[PDB]
């Protein structure tokens, strides 16, 4: 441990570089390691940016908010993260350099703390003083090297062990004469000289790659999973769409397709129903039918109540007098379906909340001649009456104990970025022109399964237009949604740019490029 | 260099282990390398199987055929291949162990030769004796270590340099009393102790990963790009389908989608035409129309003559009297299309070979009331008349100087494995039930762009059914097709297994599992 | 000839509250490895796993027995490879050591990235391999993740002249650093390295697919390549599975509530719903059939040709009234989801079924066109319940069946119900697997059983799988090979699943 | 204990002669024997065939069948069996030579095991590896 001081160019203040070990490192003997694998000597000499190792302190940020929270692991450094795929186990700490863009005419302090494994992080700078910690001042801070121990009770780690953390928060609030001033903080890492790997194994792991390579396909090349016959023509933003309740176009890094979503939305769009006894009260044209369940023959409450991939477009509460969904429908015979034409259809019975506006097995079709217990093709294709983008945007409700996709929202100050397609009318039943949005396309998150996301982190994506004269930035969450930072009805982004991986960020990260 | 002999268990012969340097290694001083990066000492001690380092000598194989041809590079060894992604450059040779499953009651010889860079490989064992080489005998061979030089005229390599090769062929034919006897040959590699890397760089490269990780999605989860509204329900084999001329479902590792193929086949299935003056001679119902080209407005001969992703189903030469394609068609108005219903359509004019049975802009629709210069929706949906699987299987001809996909064939003794879907009839125009095949699905080769193929090598895939009580093996070629080895009309493989990467093989490799 | 592909790291055992020495003589005698026996043939494919072993006390006969009284252990094994090779064979095995937390690959290419040795059939005999104890902890507790030894075909077995097979056995001794940690009562969860079987003959065992009729034959048939049965299904892991029971006789009798209406175009064929004492809420996740109730096949859409046969009679205060024979079947005679389906809906050929009345159902025969072949294929599984999986013997093997003759019931009355005589096969009897729960099977291992006839003069060898079936190695093909049911089973050894029984049944006499 | 190898006439294989003590012999002091009676020195030098010491392995024979089972006693050797009639008691082990008519173009293995008194013989070659063998 030490500190050195440098005078600033103009002599109007100083910068400090400090090296500290808040907690002693306990160098493992590695006596139980079958082999000890040395790293290339240059890997100890290269400080790379840490995944999620970037935060901005505004004068708004409270001394209660955690700015950075990072596990002490091979994932801290680019080359140890790549190298670890080749190894069964690892041992040893990291040098963690906190680079602070401070200034002598500001005021305020950071605290950085080492937190042992199986201990929770407190939302308080007062409580962080109970840990091994350092305090930095914004007037003089420039570089702080934390010698972060690998805190363990085992000779070396395998995967899936619980790890010590670095935590950074504001100790004392940022002050400046200017309202626009920010302290930018960046964390870099290299393995300590005592860092080792333990056993060569083939480089196939569940653990996420340190860099994600994205195909460079434009959004217009990707399927809209809520309207598969129509191409994506814009990325779209609308500040009133504060939540998503869709069951189609729902994917996650962890679980794959969730809700009633599928990776072949074009081959799943078609369904079949068996036509029931009876019709909706007051509307004898509105014959009931039950969607056929190949996946759910015995109608188990834990498996989906609707066929995999079948339409989740909305029509509002108790609104069949006003608007409907539209489909091609035709009766089943040898080899296919007969007399296929456009009919109005909807979910439920236009009255009861358990059925109406609910994603479940019972539908009505507005055709007066449904034969009882006969099968009918159902290909959803449009909407009719007073229907519009906002009615189609709100899906029918999920219900019961099946594994539906949850309702999701962007963090405060952010907005969802949608994959949007134009769905055309068709005329003599008559449809209306409407725009369909999806939260995500399966063709983007396909690539993300092939690389993985680091646990607890989000992809910051550049979206590149005209080769780079415009670049948008979005956060793609592992929970499936993609999101933008906005200031100030609908807003349109061209669909012929391409996604490029920028970096890993925390869910709490504020995107610097603003839409 | 040396040789040692071991007596066999029963004393009925001997095995030899030989170490040889056919050509001297020239250890680079690395004086121009900015840094020299050491490998983990255990990487020099691990012999892994080489990509494509596996061949079977039958008594059928000629002393003219090249059995193995391998570039001396970091791609020879699993851990040097993974490590090289992290580095700008490399230097040094490889130990190459040729493991021969020989026997004392066989006869015959191998030759192994080192070939300098910018020299061609001869198809002759007589000419291989002009190189630095070794000869092995099948009675006594067990292990041969070749100390293979890194032959260069530069201090160290960057990517894209031309490399020295190991070549193995039969020197003298295999003989045995048994007709079933084979010599199995396997090649393993480790870097020589003088092997080094030169400069740490972020691990992002065009160079293919040594192991491919495949999503585990079943074929039924994947789109059929020749019939997007219908799911894949079987993988399929038919020994009469000796070639593929399709323009849809054509993908390559190198170029992506080729011919008229797309990564969103469901969003590209729809087209529009402008209705021309006149009709096919003798059939006044068969009104001409031109497919609209958004991608080709000025009708450039080098850009495609048909809209991206539009139907390439066959109907035979001069056969409109016998069979047609079927579509939904409707006239364009405000917001969409009016009076949409089923019509017969086809390519060309049912007579001239430049138009009939040709994938080009001019079609006819069998509707007597097409308004001149009005636009019509076209959604292909089935086939009519004498149409069948074999008529749909042969696409319309490619023509002219646009960048079409070439006609491809399996190597002799192999057969294509097809993604197959059932396309149902529709009835009063009346369609017929037909099965549509695709050569490949975009959802499988999506994964292969995210890993790459080693240049000149093919993926051997296991296809895993019932968790492993049955496993098929297929070769997936970088040229887009997938293929099986067959002995002894159509054959059906279930679509609910999953693909698993087995290994890299040469195009010449004979799959050991036979369908 | 001693190979350590990965180094053995000697634990100090500092942390151990006691360190328990083994008898010095256990380190000096190599025993056979409990499951370490496997076969390679010219048919055995490249990249196939022949042997998988956890590196644990279970690798040796004496340390597997001793481990029953210890909480924990440390140290590796010295393995020796005994190869019954021949002068004409060529080929290679690969032996790989997998670290504790790592998944086993499915190809030779990925397996060569582990610490390994390549073993040629000309020189592999008496080769010694150290199996190291890989850990990051001072000693193991029970239930810890363990390193594996994996043996795979690297180059396939080929022969000059004649087509031999090679049987490979491992032998083992613990390395000198091997120790145990803490005395516990001799009841611990590791399988005994020897299973002792009580000498009960097959005829003394129940047939769980026909409880009233004794087993008369062990049976083999080359066309019975599949079992889909729900009855007679027992595993060492789970006990009785898929609607099977440990008292098949007591479970044989169902009741059904008669249901309104009748089969379409067949008004005599009245519906009923089987009553479900164990599933009264009618959950889709619980079985749709009473436990232990008949799973006899009666063809597909086959009611005009063949039916099942039972005694039935309506419930009363005094038990059941006017009990006599009827034809019955599962579901409808048409709908694919009901017909030939193991589910709650049945029909009975009795016009007299009163609505909401409850009827006894005692299955006891089959009628018309029903044969052995049709009884052998059970009604289909359907829905989300824990039904027994459809199983096959591995390539080149046949199931051994427990067989009983079911005699024909005849009536002389015009239109009276009439049965045809049939043989009923069960995949396993609960009376054989009885002792396997107490002993355990080693992880991923098969029991090689001797079956002993004529005082020892004829010995059939069968492989008893922990998934609940016996198989035999067989040559030729036959639709009626009989083995006497008056022998007894004797445990021979544990074997890998892909071991090929040497003792081949000449299936065409 | 030792092993020696001889090349076959034609050099098409080898024969092995092995001497082994699977279990240590415990030479009795004979302190309680009233007299100790020596055998003629030539009786230790004569290997006779054992009563029941002959079996044929066909490819039919299972690795579960016991081929030979013999008590270690004066009845093993012709002259010790005749001599023992003249004596009340005996002590000491036997050299047992197993002569195998093998060939280099066959395959397969024997196991030979010493089994202590009051222990049962298992019908399994897997279980015979638990004994000195």
Numbering used by the authors:
A (entry chain C), B (entry chain C): 2 to 429, 435 to 494, 497 to 523
C (entry chain B): 19 to 527
D (entry chain C): 2 to 134
Copy the relevant paper text.
Caliciviruses are a diverse group of non-enveloped, positive-sense RNA viruses with a wide range of hosts and transmission routes. One area of calicivirus biology that has gained increasing attention over the past decade is the conformational flexibility exhibited by the protruding (P) domains of the major capsid protein VP1. This was observed in structure analyses of capsids encoded by many species and is often a consequence of environmental cues such as metal ions, changes to pH, or receptor/co-factor engagement. The ability of P-domains to undergo conformational shifts according to environmental conditions plays a crucial role in infection, significantly influencing both receptor binding and entry, and enabling evasion of the host immune response.
